[PDB]
Design a protein around this ligand. Structure first.
Ligand code: 8TC
Ligand code: AKG
Ligand code: AKG
Ligand code: FE
Ligand code: FE
Lengths: 286, 295
């Protein structure tokens, strides 16, 4: 009794803070999954307050250009600006145990690190964002199709509420299993215009989406800044969009755990080394 | 010429004053090509001299496993060698060829440094397993020869490369086989049947090789010869380097670099286009070179 008997049933999008082997199976089966309450209530709140001054000084472009910057604010310096982010959120033992199932291989330590820490605020009346796979960031990955390894996953977390009206993210569950991975336009995608989305949540819930999954922010209302926190995580062989080890000051890196140092590139795992030695030695982190 | 003798595979040779289109054509055909005088004999001799203290402090590891042992590997070339940072990495032919491999229209430099490794193969050192350098990026073989390029190496003779002292063994045209497997008995059907050719070179010569080319260091069967190489390993901007150069190379040395050299070492970003434009290795919407103060 999930849809009225006889109706078309829409692509499946499971919801779940229980077993990691559990959430991981929903990820594998569908390409994405929701984690209701991924960051605590006040945590999501103290976080949003802490980055709000930074958001306040980001001007809004009104361009009708088609870009992803048309009335959408984006801001990446979350570690610099938010103590609760760098002290609490990125230390979710849930994140890591999930990242460990997507990415790490046995006896090789952490096969993952951060790509980005982005706060995305869809301004009211913002055109719906182009449909895309995140792994289009790494242009050849689509050419490996659904059988290729995972390159990227997003812990996409709501900051203000996510509604059909304010432009929450439209997901396409199961698009990680399509036979050919393509750009999503009328020229390159045959299914263009027939692609059945599902809008994605309340402040603190996150959805865990594969980089193979087609998606996009929808159209935005008259006075609702729809604000989100994207934890982009990639495998250790890939380069981050943000140069976090050169902008996050050494002070904050000294306060991080070994594993979070590895996420921001203040520590190696043999990639990102220093002539046969961990880069951590040279940085005065023993 | 040899005498109905079997003629082994051809490794094409060009002087460093040839058309970058002529050299790249060879690279595209065979997957590897020798560039003679890539570095001048005076430049390489100063380089060898400037890194030689660091090389002598490096213990030769001998092991009871015949392991990629008895090979010295040193990567702090920028810190240790003015010739390297002031002249060698400013090779225009090197950047001409990288652009033809990596750089898309309208996205600036599509490449950067993976590594800068002095590789000195010691007397008696055993040969290296046959491998492709793109095995570093483990999904890459699965795209086969149609896959884009992830990596190229400018592998320079610092001291002479001879068949006896362990000059690299290469397989021209292995970037074109229909299936890219690891080269072992389990997965490779040609295992044991693969014909290689050595990179015979004088100091300052180099070969340029695709990550798709099967190759391995040869056995050093001499008693005197420490066979010294300089490997300039260059990858796509989207891939992680093996060296964290921006974190170990001093900022004092960063400020002295040309802007394309800063990009190579991650002191400066490059802009990638997907409708959307994105700084790769950037700082919250701006080139990382602002926060660092490099203009
Ligand atoms: C240029 C962009 C790129 C190429 C990559 C992404 C990307 C790093 C992709 C992976 C994600 O986990 C996440 C949320 C961290 C985004 C953040 C925004 C940008 C940087 C981007 C953007 O800001 O557009 C002006 C885009 O929105 C987009 C969709 O179009 C892109 O595909
Ligand atoms: O803002 C959103 O809801 C989607 C974010 C996204 O997909 C992107 O910017 O790449
Ligand atoms: O030293 C050589 O000639 C081969 C080096 C090589 O192929 C490698 O280290 O990947
Ligand atoms: Fe996206
Ligand atoms: Fe190699």
């Amino acid at each position: 009794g999930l849809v009225p008997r006889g109706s078309h049933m829409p692509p499946r999008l499971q919801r779940f803070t229980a077993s990691a082997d559990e959430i991981f199976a929903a990820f594998q089966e569908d390409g994405c999954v929701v984690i209701e309450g991924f960051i605590s209530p006040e945590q999501v709140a103290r976080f949003s307050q802490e980055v709000d001054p930074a958001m306040e000084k980001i001007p809004v472009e009104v361009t009708n250009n088609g870009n992803s910057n048309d009335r959408t604010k984006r801001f990446s310096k979350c570690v610099i600006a938010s103590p609760t982010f760098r002290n609490e959120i990125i230390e979710s033992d849930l994140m890591h145990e999930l990242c460990d199932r997507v990415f790490s291989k046995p006896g090789e330590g952490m096969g993952y690190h951060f790509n980005d820490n982005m706060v995305i605020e869809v301004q009211p009346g913002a055109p719906a964002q182009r449909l895309h796979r995140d792994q289009e960031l790494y242009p050849w990955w689509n050419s490996m199709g659904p059988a290729g390894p995972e390159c990227l996953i997003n812990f996409f977390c709501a900051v203000t509420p996510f509604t059909e009206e304010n432009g929450a993210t439209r997901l396409v569950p199961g698009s990680h299993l399509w036979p050919e991975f393509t750009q999503i336009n009328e020229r390159d995608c045959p299914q263009f215009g027939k692609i059945e989305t599902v809008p994605a949540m309340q402040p603190g819930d996150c959805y865990l989406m594969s980089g193979k999954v087609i998606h996009g922010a929808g159209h935005n209302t008259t006075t609702d800044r729809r604000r989100a926190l994207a934890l982009s995580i990639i495998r250790r062989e890939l380069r981050p969009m943000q140069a976090f080890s050169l902008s996050v000051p050494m002070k904050l890196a000294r306060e991080m755990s070994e594993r979070s140092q590895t996420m921001f590139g203040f520590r190696s795992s043999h990639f990102w080394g220093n002539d046969g030695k961990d880069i951590a030695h040279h940085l005065g982190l023993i």
